[PDB]
Amino acid sequence: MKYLPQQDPQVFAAIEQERKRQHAKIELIASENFVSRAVMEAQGSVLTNKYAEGYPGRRYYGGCEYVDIVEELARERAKQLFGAEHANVQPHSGAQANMAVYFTVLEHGDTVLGMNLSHGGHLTHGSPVNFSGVQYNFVAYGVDPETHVIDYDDVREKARLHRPKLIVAAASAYPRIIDFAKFREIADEVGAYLMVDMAHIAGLVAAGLHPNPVPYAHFVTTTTHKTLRGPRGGMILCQEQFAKQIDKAIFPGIQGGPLMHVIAAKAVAFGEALQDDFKAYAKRVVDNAKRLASALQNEGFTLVSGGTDNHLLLVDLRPQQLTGKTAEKVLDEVGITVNKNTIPYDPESPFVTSGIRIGTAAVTTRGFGLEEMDEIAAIIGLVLKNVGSEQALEEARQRVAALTD
Amino acid sequence: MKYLPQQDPQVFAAIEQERKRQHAKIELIASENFVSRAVMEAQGSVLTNKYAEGYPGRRYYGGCEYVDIVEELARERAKQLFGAEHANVQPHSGAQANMAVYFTVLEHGDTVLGMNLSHGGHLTHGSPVNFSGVQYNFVAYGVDPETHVIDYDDVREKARLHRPKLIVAAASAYPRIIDFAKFREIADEVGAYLMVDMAHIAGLVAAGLHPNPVPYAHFVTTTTHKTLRGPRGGMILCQEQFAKQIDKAIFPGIQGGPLMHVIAAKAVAFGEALQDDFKAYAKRVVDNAKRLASALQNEGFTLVSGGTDNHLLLVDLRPQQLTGKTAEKVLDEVGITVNKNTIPYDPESPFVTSGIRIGTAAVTTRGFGLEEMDEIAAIIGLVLKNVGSEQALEEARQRVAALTD
Ligand SMILES: Nc1nc(=O)c2c([nH]1)NC[C@H](CNc1ccc(C(=O)N[C@@H](CCC(=O)O)C(=O)O)cc1)N2C=O
Ligand SMILES: Cc1ncc(COP(=O)(O)O)c(CNCC(=O)O)c1O
Ligand SMILES: Cc1ncc(COP(=O)(O)O)c(CNCC(=O)O)c1O
Secondary structure, eight states: OOHHHHHOHHHHHHHHHHHHHHHHSEEOOTTOOOOOHHHHHHHTSGGGGOOOOEETTEESSSOOHHHHHHHHHHHHHHHHHHOOSEEEOOOSSHHHHHHHHHHHHOOTTOEEEEEOTTTTOOGGGTOTTSHHHHHSEEEEEOBOTTTOSBOHHHHHHHHHHHOOSEEEEOOSSOOSOOOHHHHHHHHHHHTOEEEEEOGGGHHHHHTTSSOOSTTTOSEEEEESSSTTOOOSOEEEEEOTTTHHHHHHIIIIIIOOSOOHHHHHHHHHHHHHHHSHHHHHHHHHHHHHHHHHHHHHHHTTOEEGGGSOSSSEEEEEOGGGTOOHHHHHHHHHHTTEEOEEOOOTTOSSOTTTOSEEEEEOHHHHHTTOOHHHHHHHHHHHHHHHSSTTOHHHHHHHHHHHHHHHO | OOSHHHHOHHHHHHHHHHHHHHHHSEEOOTTOOOOOHHHHHHHTSGGGGOOOOEETTEESSSOOHHHHHHHHHHHHHHHHHHOOSEEEOOOSSHHHHHHHHHHHHOOTTOEEEEEOTTTTOOGGGTOTTSHHHHHSEEEEEOBOTTTOOBOHHHHHHHHHHHOOSEEEEOOSSOOSOOOHHHHHHHHHHTTOEEEEEOTTTHHHHHTTSSOOSTTTOSEEEEESSSTTOOOSOEEEEEOHHHHHHHHHIIIIIIOSSOOHHHHHHHHHHHHHHHSSHHHHHHHHHHHHHHHHHHHHHHTTOEEGGGSOSSSEEEEEOTTTTOOHHHHHHHHHHHTEEOEEOOOTTOSSOTTTOSEEEEEOHHHHHTTOOHHHHHHHHHHHHHHHTOSSOHHHHHHHHHHHHHHHO
């Protein structure tokens, strides 16, 4: 950094603190990752200066000649990656992406079937304190009480009982592969659209390690920053019969000017995803996730669903008579960054919760493999099973320190 | 740029073309500007990797220690700048800022008084192809058909007729000062809330060159990238009495995790506006708009409202028999970037228009003064009064190139 340190030592100090913390801690938040320098250079570019309301070739402003190239690259690399018919790379968030789809297909008060929030569903899938749950009438479907796998009989029963205008599939915390085909079938049965929110698993879908929802859904929404390893932003993929409406939902509907600089970073992120070692990288996340789980089970921990088929895991903390809030706190001292997360049928609420959610995308990006996963679990065991021991804490500290050197 | 040109030649080439275009053309788009290198560096930082749903000290994730300072610098510097009691620096956009205000105070279908889109109002101030107009009952107030100044008598009439729950004040293409005192007076008569969208005029308000709306409005919304000269994003300003409700609207309401990297650049831009130099700048911005308006009228051009009191000016192109769309394309041919803009009581639709909107924020940023403004209007007169003349176009190009080097 050149001009920042000289003009804003306060902001620069904060960013340097953050740049060091990212290397110091062992980052297990499942949502997170670390982008390349190419990706940062694109969002730190001068594309922030351009107003480009509209779409490539159909803008509301002059001079969008070169910013149209960047959007088309993003769109055509996105279509190459997921094999969708159309792509909208302007959504600012995963939330704005969801909001735009819902905007396009639903009316105020329509009924929507989305995954139960404490079973794995996301905020924008029906929380009553989110716009989705205020704007629309969401009914939830859940996971099996003992296997913690989506109950497809439950999904079809809710579907037929509530007759939803659209069905949402996917999650923020479900460690198992989601069967898009059954979702498509149930929706056809009741004449509902299908929306797949692939945010968490988009990089895994991209590398062939998770079934692709594109062939089965009308609308596919994603973030560009979780397993896809891109800039913070959103994206909508859809059949070409919904394209004109999807694009109008984004603009002139819920958004204003896109973030061309972030759209250039999405373009770079997708570029990286199309390359062969992204497929390689993705396999290690999933392998590392598998390994981490097993290592955790060996330390005596209980995992919701018994393990994972993707990048994240959900620890049911109860048997260490722990809550997810203290677990989270405790590991933040020793350098492990996780996030408290409700568990299916959690006996407590989503402010305290009974578990921690963990993922390997970030550490895998920094080069950790199987044997370093074994140690992460070891340290989590040492720490969580001996919560007030200052000696356990400090031991934890050197071992984390030994991993991030 | 270090890694981009080697990682991604296709993206790098388009970013580089944009950069060249930004220097070679005369960027007159009124909502555009050029950010500092310090601002871009913050945007290209590692702060994009951090999930930070929540607010500083009240996150739903660990490791937010540094990002919390980033967000407090932005809020505290914003409050210094505009004297608000509370500030939300999380809106991804000016669209999302507005949406969060509406989500907090209005209930689906509620009646809102906003400025008409063709007399100057913004898309999110009631357009029927926008969520604002689809989600709420928007009635519009307009400008005098002769003097093109907001008709406060009209505002007050509609308020009493329609008794909205909220009155929106401000715009995208009004070139005169907005009297916030009368707006609040009217809102108070009819028991409505008053929200001011100062997106276009934040830098001026910050600099003491436009009456500040903060003391008259319950809510103040703004973008950070227009006359404020910050990164692309939004911000909400409000009285303590509404803060909690405003923060909840942004999250868990309408957004997900914030763009922490973008909040870092907002804090940088607020620091820059807090400096003494920024007041010099904004004074020149308006003086340049005054001089370019007068210069424009010397070449025969009619201006909506007779001139400008701010950073913006609107050309009614009817007298010279051209559409807004035609003027824009021709001016793009000689290297002058503007945007077609509807004009009050426009006989043309929003993609053709009978006018062009011009602003001096960005060219002032790049150092242009009074004499360059005389040249610009001369180059603009030359071109729009000789559209068929290829010899006129080449001359124009050279004068542009002489101005931008
Ligand atoms: N007064 C004013 N308000 C604004 O909100 C605004 C400006 N000017 N100028 C520039 C920028 C341009 N935005 C637009 C974008 C779409 C439409 C819109 O009404 N489109 C209609 C009909 C257009 C057609 O001819 O294709 C639609 O059907 O899409 C209008 C202004 N902008 C705000 O961003
Ligand atoms: C399934 C799913 N869908 C949308 C989002 C929204 O993203 P944002 O950029 O934050 O608006 C998410 C993000 N989840 C946060 C987390 O999992 O921690 C998501 O998982
Ligand atoms: C008055 C006014 N209010 C909000 C916005 C929103 O901005 P964005 O970041 O693009 O969502 C704007 C934007 N102006 C567009 C234009 O005037 O060029 C605005 O003017």
